[PDB]
Design an enzyme around this catalytic site. Structure first.
Site, PDB file in Angstrom:
ATOM      1  N   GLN A 257       4.053   6.090   4.966  1.00 46.21           N
ATOM      2  CA  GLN A 257       3.626   7.442   5.352  1.00 46.21           C
ATOM      3  C   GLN A 257       4.561   8.022   6.390  1.00 46.21           C
ATOM      4  OE1 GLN A 257      -0.204   9.850   7.333  1.00 46.21           O
ATOM      5  NE2 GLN A 257      -0.546   8.199   5.900  1.00 46.21           N
TER       6      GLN A 257
ATOM      7  N   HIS B 254      -6.527  13.019  -2.431  1.00 42.33           N
ATOM      8  CA  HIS B 254      -5.164  13.326  -1.971  1.00 42.33           C
ATOM      9  C   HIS B 254      -4.413  13.944  -3.130  1.00 42.33           C
ATOM     10  CE1 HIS B 254      -5.472  11.149   1.865  1.00 42.33           C
ATOM     11  NE2 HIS B 254      -6.415  10.512   1.192  1.00 42.33           N
TER      12      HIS B 254
ATOM     13  N   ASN C 295      -3.908  13.579   4.496  1.00 41.11           N
ATOM     14  CA  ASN C 295      -4.790  14.610   5.034  1.00 41.11           C
ATOM     15  C   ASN C 295      -5.896  13.985   5.878  1.00 41.11           C
ATOM     16  OD1 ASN C 295      -7.291  14.102   3.522  1.00 41.11           O
ATOM     17  ND2 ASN C 295      -6.150  14.803   1.718  1.00 41.11           N
TER      18      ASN C 295
ATOM     19  N   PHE D 279       0.827  -1.200   0.000  1.00 42.11           N
ATOM     20  CA  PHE D 279       0.000   0.000   0.000  1.00 42.11           C
ATOM     21  C   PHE D 279       0.871   1.265   0.000  1.00 42.11           C
ATOM     22  CE2 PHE D 279      -3.365   2.574   2.547  1.00 42.11           C
ATOM     23  CZ  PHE D 279      -3.650   3.305   1.422  1.00 42.11           C
TER      24      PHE D 279
END
EC number: 5.2.1.8
Length: 165
Positions: free
Chosen positions: A63, A126, A102, A60
């Site tokens: 982050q 995004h 966000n 995935f």
């Protein structure tokens, strides 16, 4: 005026792993690109140096960018407040895409993610603003320290960062 390139030197529990570099699409999303660029150089007096990748989910994304709380709850932009979604011109087309994290419309701060898979469901939600140019292999190596729930099995940090010519 060429799109900027910035680098992250990654470490794992303090040991060097390698360097990832990114092309920032200032030609298409200048405000968002500039935020990331200036957080990478630290020229505003805060930014990514020393921060961690707190949520890595294999297949995935990776982050990071929460340089204030190190867990996904913090971060701030160079604009004195969270800022707007600039545009959605660019899409999440596959691994290496660099996009803003966000918590709702128009809440961009400093957190970002590097895709390690196509994430088309994020299109229009995004803001995509860059891509990995060198060191995708290093992102893949980072990815291996992740887990299904995103918790990392070693501390993954930006030990240095800045802008390359």
């Amino acid at each position: 005026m060429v799109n900027p390139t910035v680098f992250f030197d990654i470490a794992v529990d303090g040991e060097p792993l390698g360097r990832v570099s990114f092309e920032l699409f200032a030609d298409k999303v200048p405000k968002t690109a500039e935020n990331f660029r200036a957080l990478s150089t630290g020229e505003k007096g805060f930014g990514y140096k020393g921060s961690c990748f707190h949520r890595i989910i294999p297949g995935f994304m990776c982050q990071g960018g929460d340089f204030t709380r190190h867990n996904g709850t913090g971060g701030k932009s160079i604009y004195g407040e969270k800022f707007e979604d600039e545009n959605f011109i660019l899409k999440h087309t596959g691994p290496g895409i660099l996009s803003m994290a966000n918590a709702g419309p128009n809440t961009n701060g400093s957190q970002f993610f590097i895709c390690t898979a196509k994430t088309e469901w994020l299109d229009g939600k995004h803001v995509v603003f860059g891509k990995v140019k060198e060191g995708m292999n290093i992102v893949e190596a980072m990815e291996r320290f992740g887990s299904r729930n995103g918790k990392t099995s070693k501390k993954i940090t930006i030990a240095d960062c800045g802008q390359l010519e």
